[PDB]
Amino acid sequence: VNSFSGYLKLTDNVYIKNADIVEEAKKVKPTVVVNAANVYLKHGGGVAGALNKATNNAMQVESDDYIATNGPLKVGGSCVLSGHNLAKHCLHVVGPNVNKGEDIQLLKSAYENFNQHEVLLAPLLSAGIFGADPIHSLRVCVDTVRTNVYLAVFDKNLYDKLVSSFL
Numbered sequence: 001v002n003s004f005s006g007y008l009k010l011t012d013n014v015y016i017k018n019a020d021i022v023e024e025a026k027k028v029k030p031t032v033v034v035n036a037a038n039v040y041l042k043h044g045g046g047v048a049g050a051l052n053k054a055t056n057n058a059m060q061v062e063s064d065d066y067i068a069t070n071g072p073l074k075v076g077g078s079c080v081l082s083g084h085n086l087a088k089h090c091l092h093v094v095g096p097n098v099n100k101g102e103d104i105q106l107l108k109s110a111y112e113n114f115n116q117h118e119v120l121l122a123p124l125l126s127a128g129i130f131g132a133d134p135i136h137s138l139r140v141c142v143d144t145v146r147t148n149v150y151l152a153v154f155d156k157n158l159y160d161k162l163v164s165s166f167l
C-alpha cells in the first residue's frame with residue numbers, strides 16, 4: 001500500500017491523475033519525483049521551472065554545482081539529486097525535445113531510467129514544451145516502465161483525452 005490517492009489505474013504498474021505535480025509532491029512527499037529536465041539542468045519552464053520555483057531555487061543551485069562537476073547529461077539520461085521540500089529524491093530525466101529536433105526513439109531510453117526506482121511520481125516525458133505527442137509518451141511509458149509509476153497530468157483536457165484514447 002502507498003499514499004497516492006485519486007489515481008486511475010491504467011495497467012498493473014501505471015497510474016494516472018489530473019494533478020499539478022508540484023502540489024502532488026508537496027502532499028505525498030514521494031521517495032522519487034521525476035523532473036522533465038534538459039541536459040544543462042536549466043530549470044526555466046514547464047515542469048522543471050515549476051518544480052524549481054517550489055524549491056525556492058534550491059534545485060537550480062544544486063543542479064548548477066552538479067553540472068560544474070559532471071558536465072551535461074545525455075538526451076535519454078538522468079541523474080539523482082535531492083528532492084528538497086518536494087520528495088526524498090528528484091530523478092532528473094532528459095526526454096528528447098522535439099522543438100530542438102531530438103530523436104523521439106530516445107523517449108524509450110528516457111523512460112528506462114524509471115526502472116531503477118520501485119515507485120515514482122512523474123510527468124509524461126517529452127510532453128508539454130518538449131513538443132512530443134503526450135498520447136505517444138503515455139504509450140512508451142506503459143510499454144517501457146515496469147516499476148510503479150504515478151503520472152500527474154496538469155491539463156484536465158489532456159488528462160481526459162489520454163484516458164479516453166488509452167488502449
Ligand SMILES: CN(C(=O)[C@@]12CCC[C@@H]1C2)c1cn[nH]c1
Pocket residue numbers: 067068069070071
Ligand atoms: C563543467 N565544469 C568542469 O568540468 C570543471 C571546469 C573548471 C572547474 C570544474 C570542473 C564547470 C562548469 N562550470 N564550472 C566548472
